[PDB]
Amino acid sequence: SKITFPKDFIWGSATAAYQIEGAYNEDGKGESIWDRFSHTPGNIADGHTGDVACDHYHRYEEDIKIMKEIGIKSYRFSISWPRIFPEGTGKLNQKGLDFYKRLTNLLLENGIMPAITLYHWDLPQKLQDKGGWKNRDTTDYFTEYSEVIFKNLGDIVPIWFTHNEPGVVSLLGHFLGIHAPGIKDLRTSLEVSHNLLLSHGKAVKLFREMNIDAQIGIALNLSYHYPASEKAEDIEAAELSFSLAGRWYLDPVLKGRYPENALKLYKKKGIELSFPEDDLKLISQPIDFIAFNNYSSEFIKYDPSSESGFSPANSILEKFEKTDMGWIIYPEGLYDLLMLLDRDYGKPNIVISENGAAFKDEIGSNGKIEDTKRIQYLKDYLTQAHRAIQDGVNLKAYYLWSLLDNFEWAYGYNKRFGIVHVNFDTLERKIKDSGYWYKEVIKNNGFLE
Amino acid sequence: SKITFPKDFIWGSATAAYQIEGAYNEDGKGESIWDRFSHTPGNIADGHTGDVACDHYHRYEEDIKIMKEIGIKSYRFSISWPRIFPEGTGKLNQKGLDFYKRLTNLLLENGIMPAITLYHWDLPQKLQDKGGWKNRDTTDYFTEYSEVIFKNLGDIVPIWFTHNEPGVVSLLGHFLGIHAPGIKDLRTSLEVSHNLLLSHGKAVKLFREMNIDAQIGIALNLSYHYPASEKAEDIEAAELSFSLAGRWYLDPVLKGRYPENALKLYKKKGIELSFPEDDLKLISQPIDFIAFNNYSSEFIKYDPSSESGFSPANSILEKFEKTDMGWIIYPEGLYDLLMLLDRDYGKPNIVISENGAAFKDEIGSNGKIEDTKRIQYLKDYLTQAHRAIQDGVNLKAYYLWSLLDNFEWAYGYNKRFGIVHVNFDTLERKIKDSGYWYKEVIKNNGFLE
């Protein structure tokens, strides 16, 4: 029927600093927890690292020329804290500022709109030696680094994101220890989650003290959690999952409270931590939008066997086509989530910081990546993005993960979310057909479903 | 019978940069191969690191005050290449220069004589990413860093050392892989040995050209290798040891050649390497003294089972008292060595860069270390040091390993060579009776054995 998005609708594409930049020990960059986690056997697939990656630190001219060829209206990227403070606090590395100052000024001049994320998982490894995000002092040092970025880049950068997916940091990084910094303790994982949100609060508070003419938010990891069957135990098992997962960070930020059903689950395993009541008021600090990262959806069943009181319903999930990551494809799962954010947090302004997919790419005998599946995935999800805007959602932006094939954390370079293929041996970019598609979607401001 | 050393004789004590300094990521210091090797499980005992160590970087005032309170006339220490050049070459780091500038000036102003080692194993990790010592271009970068140190600290600082124990670096670090950078390939272990020596040559050749009013040398790991029995297979086995071990580095430096018997061992397992045979004239470059590091002596027997063609004669070695390291005590094994270097290399000027011993220390109820064994060890070895000077040897200096308790590489902090006890929780120095002994031994010159 032709879908057309709002005229003012910002199209964009996203990347992260460690994932693409490289140059892990150049121009006075301090070590990050990821440099350190990446160097140790057993952590990354095939013993990959982010030492070189896409080498975006040197080749950012070539990238921007590509970005403009496709003609994205907004490039979402991450600032490396260790390039701005190698020691987390103290001596400013002016080289690392200049790089991001330059990059932003090349974006503005090429008519592309900058969208900065202030913490995309790096954490200087020096703050990790004094406890990292467990040491509350880190939340102040985050604010110092936030301050210096705002002074320099404040006004000229419209869209800000304090943190990317604090959910995965605390869960994978501090409880399961298959992300950096590789810690494995439940109590610590909950102390960090708080200390992260607090750090978001302190940045917003400072962002209002300075009065930067720009919009700030927080990028959360969010999926819809559907019950396995419309039965009291399974509906409740799902509501507890979403609470432990995405509502644990949504409710403190937007409702100035932690979800009760989750908190009860923690104390039933003999764990309470007395969050000071003032900290939640500081976390709840009003924000100009909520941003989130979606890819799939979860199907939870009741399970006394898991100490959680629930588990995935693998019976149901083995009915969907799966991405290369093993994650189900379910486009409507996006719509229902948008509607959940609309009908639980007061019709806020919504941004999509990340949405995309990972399929096995090849360069064919024609020297081209014909990733019809990625394209299929994309347009399916974007039809449900549109559907939600039609039914009254305030979705202001869509950022495609990712612009470039990059370092996918504990999977290494074995998974490609890029719309621009990157050969990690030659560092040659080949714009995918999902790149050329996206270009036309931005131009036409839609596609004929 | 009282022994008295020459009146000019320089008494000293020795430490290394990574073993005491700490501040492993402060004031722009680049990562080293040791920082990297320490941070990986299964390398260092009890997962110990040199991240903090004795924290000499911040507490050097205190450590000089002690150095002056005890006699010592010269302090031998190591400069961290990564503090000078974080990337091994290119951008300076003036904060790293100023630290070692300031340190040396406090030594000259407290009437103590500086003795600098230029490479004590902390190769910048960036150069290890481009092949490290196996990439010949590291032997040029070594010279660049040497240049900058000579410009600033050349004429002041009388004693220099190009390398520390390049025998261990190549054997442990690049064949056995139990030292940094952890590599396990024989071929690569000999290519590095050559590249290290070559790097020594280039530094001495650059020294002079600049015309620095001071003496340069090289600190080599050196024992004596006694045959198990006075038999043709055992005498020869012992000669082939030594040749692999210490002579491999002695002969190239002082004779301009590699030991034949050894080279013949390496071609018998199908391994040659084309020495450009003019590098060897650059390595052989005359040098003002030869320095070495002795602790024990080896007793080799013939062994067709060991693909070496020899092994330790455990039958004999189990008749000596043993240090905490498991190394035999044999004082006369110093003398015979001091006669072997005196005979076979043209009565050179000799320095002892290191001697000392590791015994289990306790703080008694009197809050004092009564390390009678360390004192016993010391005086036993020094008596044979004297004996060699009486029988003609040109031994100009003795440096006690070590001033402080430190990071003993793969053994962690489990081993104490120090004459100054260091508590690696509090960082409190308690001078170790062996310390107080050594103060009197410097003041009255020798001692009554």
mmCIF file of N, CA and C in Angstrom, chain A residues 24-28 31 35-36 39-41 51 86-87 91 95 125-126 129, chain B residues 24-28 31 35-36 39-41 51 86-87 91 95 125-126 129:
data_model
loop_
_atom_site.group_PDB
_atom_site.id
_atom_site.type_symbol
_atom_site.label_atom_id
_atom_site.label_comp_id
_atom_site.label_asym_id
_atom_site.label_seq_id
_atom_site.Cartn_x
_atom_site.Cartn_y
_atom_site.Cartn_z
ATOM 1 N N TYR A 24 44.161 0.343 19.588
ATOM 2 C CA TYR A 24 43.783 0.065 20.994
ATOM 3 C C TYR A 24 44.817 0.663 21.954
ATOM 4 N N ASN A 25 46.008 1.022 21.458
ATOM 5 C CA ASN A 25 47.131 1.562 22.275
ATOM 6 C C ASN A 25 47.868 2.644 21.477
ATOM 7 N N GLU A 26 47.132 3.540 20.826
ATOM 8 C CA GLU A 26 47.692 4.638 20.000
ATOM 9 C C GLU A 26 47.288 5.986 20.623
ATOM 10 N N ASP A 27 48.126 7.009 20.440
ATOM 11 C CA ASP A 27 47.857 8.430 20.798
ATOM 12 C C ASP A 27 47.401 8.559 22.262
ATOM 13 N N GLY A 28 47.938 7.715 23.151
ATOM 14 C CA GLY A 28 47.813 7.853 24.615
ATOM 15 C C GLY A 28 46.506 7.304 25.152
ATOM 16 N N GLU A 31 44.289 1.606 28.587
ATOM 17 C CA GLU A 31 43.659 0.275 28.429
ATOM 18 C C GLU A 31 42.204 0.374 28.878
ATOM 19 N N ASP A 35 39.845 -4.296 26.156
ATOM 20 C CA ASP A 35 41.244 -4.584 25.758
ATOM 21 C C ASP A 35 41.686 -5.774 26.599
ATOM 22 N N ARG A 36 41.559 -5.671 27.923
ATOM 23 C CA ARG A 36 42.002 -6.674 28.927
ATOM 24 C C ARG A 36 41.243 -7.999 28.814
ATOM 25 N N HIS A 39 42.198 -10.069 25.626
ATOM 26 C CA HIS A 39 43.617 -10.506 25.522
ATOM 27 C C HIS A 39 43.784 -11.876 26.193
ATOM 28 N N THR A 40 42.787 -12.311 26.954
ATOM 29 C CA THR A 40 42.869 -13.524 27.801
ATOM 30 C C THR A 40 42.189 -14.712 27.127
ATOM 31 N N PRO A 41 42.882 -15.858 26.947
ATOM 32 C CA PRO A 41 42.275 -17.057 26.349
ATOM 33 C C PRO A 41 40.962 -17.552 26.989
ATOM 34 N N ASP A 51 41.537 -5.108 18.844
ATOM 35 C CA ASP A 51 42.821 -4.378 18.697
ATOM 36 C C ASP A 51 42.774 -3.569 17.400
ATOM 37 N N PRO A 86 42.858 8.377 29.983
ATOM 38 C CA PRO A 86 43.501 7.061 30.012
ATOM 39 C C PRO A 86 43.459 6.404 31.399
ATOM 40 N N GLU A 87 43.436 7.222 32.466
ATOM 41 C CA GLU A 87 43.443 6.790 33.895
ATOM 42 C C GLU A 87 42.034 6.892 34.514
ATOM 43 N N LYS A 91 44.444 13.540 34.189
ATOM 44 C CA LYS A 91 45.165 14.153 33.046
ATOM 45 C C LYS A 91 44.360 13.918 31.772
ATOM 46 N N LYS A 95 44.670 14.683 22.543
ATOM 47 C CA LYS A 95 44.710 13.935 21.254
ATOM 48 C C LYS A 95 43.363 13.228 21.010
ATOM 49 N N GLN A 125 40.536 0.632 32.358
ATOM 50 C CA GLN A 125 40.905 -0.573 33.148
ATOM 51 C C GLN A 125 41.514 -0.166 34.486
ATOM 52 N N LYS A 126 41.930 1.102 34.615
ATOM 53 C CA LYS A 126 42.468 1.684 35.876
ATOM 54 C C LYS A 126 41.356 1.825 36.925
ATOM 55 N N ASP A 129 40.550 -1.571 38.450
ATOM 56 C CA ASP A 129 41.539 -2.004 39.467
ATOM 57 C C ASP A 129 41.132 -1.461 40.834
ATOM 58 N N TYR B 24 51.529 0.869 36.822
ATOM 59 C CA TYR B 24 51.636 0.107 35.549
ATOM 60 C C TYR B 24 50.839 0.775 34.413
ATOM 61 N N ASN B 25 50.060 1.828 34.700
ATOM 62 C CA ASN B 25 49.209 2.518 33.689
ATOM 63 C C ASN B 25 49.033 3.991 34.068
ATOM 64 N N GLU B 26 50.046 4.593 34.689
ATOM 65 C CA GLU B 26 49.975 5.969 35.233
ATOM 66 C C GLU B 26 50.869 6.851 34.363
ATOM 67 N N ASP B 27 50.591 8.159 34.345
ATOM 68 C CA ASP B 27 51.393 9.243 33.699
ATOM 69 C C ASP B 27 51.824 8.864 32.270
ATOM 70 N N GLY B 28 50.986 8.090 31.564
ATOM 71 C CA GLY B 28 51.094 7.836 30.114
ATOM 72 C C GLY B 28 51.921 6.612 29.802
ATOM 73 N N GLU B 31 51.537 -0.029 27.858
ATOM 74 C CA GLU B 31 51.546 -1.449 28.296
ATOM 75 C C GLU B 31 52.862 -2.115 27.892
ATOM 76 N N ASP B 35 53.165 -6.552 31.789
ATOM 77 C CA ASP B 35 51.772 -6.119 32.117
ATOM 78 C C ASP B 35 50.791 -7.115 31.499
ATOM 79 N N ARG B 36 51.006 -7.456 30.230
ATOM 80 C CA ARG B 36 50.152 -8.367 29.427
ATOM 81 C C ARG B 36 50.234 -9.796 29.967
ATOM 82 N N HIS B 39 48.659 -10.407 33.535
ATOM 83 C CA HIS B 39 47.183 -10.232 33.558
ATOM 84 C C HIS B 39 46.453 -11.479 33.044
ATOM 85 N N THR B 40 47.174 -12.502 32.591
ATOM 86 C CA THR B 40 46.584 -13.744 32.036
ATOM 87 C C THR B 40 46.703 -14.869 33.058
ATOM 88 N N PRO B 41 45.614 -15.600 33.378
ATOM 89 C CA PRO B 41 45.704 -16.746 34.286
ATOM 90 C C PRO B 41 46.724 -17.800 33.823
ATOM 91 N N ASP B 51 51.463 -4.881 39.059
ATOM 92 C CA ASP B 51 50.597 -3.688 38.901
ATOM 93 C C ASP B 51 51.001 -2.658 39.955
ATOM 94 N N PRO B 86 55.580 5.021 25.102
ATOM 95 C CA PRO B 86 54.446 4.116 25.293
ATOM 96 C C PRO B 86 54.198 3.215 24.078
ATOM 97 N N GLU B 87 54.460 3.728 22.870
ATOM 98 C CA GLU B 87 54.290 3.009 21.576
ATOM 99 C C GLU B 87 55.623 2.428 21.068
ATOM 100 N N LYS B 91 56.056 9.263 19.724
ATOM 101 C CA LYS B 91 55.703 10.313 20.719
ATOM 102 C C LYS B 91 56.425 10.072 22.065
ATOM 103 N N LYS B 95 56.773 13.048 30.981
ATOM 104 C CA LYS B 95 56.481 12.686 32.400
ATOM 105 C C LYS B 95 57.320 11.477 32.836
ATOM 106 N N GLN B 125 54.449 -3.274 24.580
ATOM 107 C CA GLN B 125 53.585 -4.355 24.027
ATOM 108 C C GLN B 125 53.231 -4.059 22.569
ATOM 109 N N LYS B 126 53.293 -2.793 22.153
ATOM 110 C CA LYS B 126 52.996 -2.376 20.755
ATOM 111 C C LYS B 126 54.005 -3.002 19.791
ATOM 112 N N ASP B 129 53.433 -6.602 19.163
ATOM 113 C CA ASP B 129 52.329 -6.773 18.175
ATOM 114 C C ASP B 129 52.892 -6.805 16.745
#
